[PDB]
Amino acid sequence: TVSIQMAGNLWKVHVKAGDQIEKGQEVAILESMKMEIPIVADRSGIVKEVKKKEGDFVNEGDVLLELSNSTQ
Numbered sequence: 785t786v787s788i789q790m791a792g793n794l795w796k797v798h799v800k801a802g803d804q805i806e807k808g809q810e811v812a813i814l815e816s817m818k819m820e821i822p823i824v825a826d827r828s829g830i831v832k833e834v835k836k837k838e839g840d841f842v843n844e845g846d847v848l849l850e851l852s853n854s855t856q
Contacts, residue, residue, distance in 0.1 A: 786826045786849050788842040792816025794823075796838050799849055803831045812836070812848060829853030 786805075788794065795813040805811055805825040812823040829851030836848050 785847055785854050786811065786851070787845050787847045788812075788814060788823060788836075789844055790814060790816055790821070791843050792821075794836050794838065794840050794842045794848075795820050797834065797836060797848075799831045799834050801831055801833050805829060805831060805851075814842065823848065827851070827853070 792814045795815040797812040799805065799811055806828045807825055809825045810822050811825050814821050814823050830853060832850045832852045834849045836842060
């Protein structure tokens with residue numbers, strides 16, 4: 785699974801089900817602390833599903849997405 789690491793609102797998201805990501809690739813952006821901060825893939829994989837959308841509330845450990853390689 786991949787998850788947000790801080791409280792905020794999920795400024796934008798760049799994945800969809802069936803997309804592919806690689807460790808350290810950008811995946812979303814998080815608005816908090818009166819800044820915007822990138823969110824990067826904890827691991828590579830095909831995206832199985834996305835659990836969030838643009839502007840949704842997010843938190844530390846709150847899920848962003850699920851993979852066709854999430855350990856498994």
